[PDB]
Design a binder for this molecule. Sequence first.
Ligand SMILES: Nc1ncnc2c1ncn2[C@@H]1O[C@H](COP(=O)(O)OP(=O)(O)O)[C@@H](O)[C@H]1O
Ligand SMILES: Nc1ncnc2c1ncn2[C@@H]1O[C@H](COP(=O)(O)OP(=O)(O)O)[C@@H](O)[C@H]1O
Ligand SMILES: Nc1ncnc2c1ncn2[C@@H]1O[C@H](COP(=O)(O)OP(=O)(O)O)[C@@H](O)[C@H]1O
Ligand SMILES: [Mg+2]
Ligand SMILES: [Mg+2]
Ligand SMILES: [Mg+2]
Lengths: 103, 246, 143, 49, 52
Amino acid sequence: AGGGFFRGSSILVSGVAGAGKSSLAAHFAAAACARGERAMYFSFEEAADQAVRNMRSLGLDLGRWRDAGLLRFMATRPTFYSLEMHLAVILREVMRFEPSVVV
Amino acid sequence: GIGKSPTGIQGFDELTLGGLPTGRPSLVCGSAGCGKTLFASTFLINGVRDHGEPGVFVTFEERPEDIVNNVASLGFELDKLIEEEKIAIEHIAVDPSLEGLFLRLELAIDTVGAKRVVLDTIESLFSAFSNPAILRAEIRRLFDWLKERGLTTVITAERGDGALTRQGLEEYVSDCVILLDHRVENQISTRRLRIVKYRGTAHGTNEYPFLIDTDGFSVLPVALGLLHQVHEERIASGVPDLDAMM
Amino acid sequence: DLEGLFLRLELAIDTVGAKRVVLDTIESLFSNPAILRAEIRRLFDWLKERGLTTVITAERGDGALTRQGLEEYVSDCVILLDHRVENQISTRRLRIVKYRGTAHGTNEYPFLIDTDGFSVLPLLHQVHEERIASGVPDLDAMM
Amino acid sequence: GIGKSPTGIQGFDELTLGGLPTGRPSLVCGSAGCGKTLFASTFLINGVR
Amino acid sequence: DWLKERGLTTVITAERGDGALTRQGLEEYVSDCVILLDHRVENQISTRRLRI
Ligand SMILES: Nc1ncnc2c1ncn2[C@@H]1O[C@H](COP(=O)(O)OP(=O)(O)O)[C@@H](O)[C@H]1O
Ligand SMILES: Nc1ncnc2c1ncn2[C@@H]1O[C@H](COP(=O)(O)OP(=O)(O)O)[C@@H](O)[C@H]1O
Ligand SMILES: Nc1ncnc2c1ncn2[C@@H]1O[C@H](COP(=O)(O)OP(=O)(O)O)[C@@H](O)[C@H]1O
Ligand SMILES: [Mg+2]
Ligand SMILES: [Mg+2]
Ligand SMILES: [Mg+2]
């Protein structure tokens, strides 16, 4: 109705494999970076170069924003740390980047 | 900064970020069969081989021939290094009938230009008789002697009754404590290690599994993830129809 | 006195001219770590000198490896036997805690003490290229 | 390598890569009924026969 | 050994407890045939188990 989810809110993007979830998330992030806001993308199964290149196929130059500095891409894997360590590291990087959107 | 000295063990050197603390004592706690003596053999031999660091191996129980056989069956050419005058084995006993250790160590150190030292079963002296109440004093005495000599130390220990050490005080007199384990889940044995404590550096605070093979004491390196290589070229499947499908 | 043991040992060793030695119920003979540890190492050293392949019995009712808790560490080879009884069935298992100088089977292994004696069961094969009959004609012709 | 004296106990010999260490102390730990004395007895009898 | 010389089949009865699976543990090693009995409770019903 109002034309977009509320600024400070939580969006869930349920789906199956190969459904476009990561693509819609990257689109949110790219729109934020274009608006000039800061964005962070936490990939727990995909590399930064890999995902950005995968998004080239959808006309998204995520690497451009990453080079500019309005996008911070954190690539990690669950089994490496404990859940507490993952939480702490996520909050750490978020506090240091002061992002506006977080995937 | 903090001084470091690699063990030559790939993976373990990543956990410790440089290896065991150089010129400081470390305790490799472990029950029978975990591989403490093999870890120390690796320490000294690989220090000589790669890092040009000579060392001396003090054994309080077994014979030098036994040590040589045990480490040689793996592949470590220790007999050659012994006769090369770059490494030395020193045998000491209990129930025979302080400065003796220092003097024998001085002889070996000046003979082989030693900077690394291994003490295998210093337990013997303290455990055979607990009558003297100055056991911790003797422990810290030898520790301070080696620290004065600026020698890296790898003290082995025994952990049968429980805890991390049977002595109860050695774990707190050592700087870097490495616990070795060899547990049996189902009916399968898994070998593990952990950096219980390290003074002044970040270390691997979790159980890293290790293996003892002919290659030696091996640790699967750690963290090999999300560092992928991104190729834009395409690979053939052998099924041209499938290939054309994308 | 400890000399009588060696006195009795040498006569038997050289009488049958043997190279294998077995010791049993030595914990009772031992019956304060110093005395025990020292005499253990002494006897093992003498047997080594004589070149005898030695197998010593050890019982561990109270502890994980020996009754006293400090006898095990002096040996060069260690083998632990166990008899567990989960549920109601009982199984006998053997494992090698330590075997310096070689590679062995770290895993536990089941053994049976039948009338024959100790028994244990310890990855590919070549493939035959001839066919067999199922006895069902239509099924054997389906391929 | 090192010398091995076969115990004659198939399976066990394969796991020990031949047998027990030759001319060395070897311990047969375990509680009552585990089979220690019989294991050593078979060591001797197999070596003999 | 007196009994063995005299040729007498002896049943020696002993107890357990006190934080150990047997009172002493060294009597087991003396015996030649060890028979363990147990009175164990599952849920709220107990059963009588014999083992050799
Ligand atoms: N140009 C394109 N045309 C059609 N489909 C595409 C195109 N680019 C990507 N896709 C599809 O998008 C999917 C990948 O989306 P992605 O964001 O990775 O979803 P998820 O990460 O949730 O699996 C794949 O199934 C792929 O086939
Ligand atoms: N060639 C080898 N290959 C694999 N493992 C070996 C080899 N030689 C020794 N080991 C291992 O070393 C272990 C004992 O090492 P050591 O540290 O000398 O004894 P302990 O752990 O009692 O101090 C054994 O469990 C054995 O599996
Ligand atoms: N003739 C036999 N038939 C079947 N099992 C036997 C025979 N002789 C011995 N055993 C088994 O071997 C084991 C030997 O026990 P033993 O060696 O006397 O105990 P330990 O030496 O551990 O004190 C026993 O538990 C018994 O069940
Ligand atoms: Mg996805
Ligand atoms: Mg050893
Ligand atoms: Mg018996």
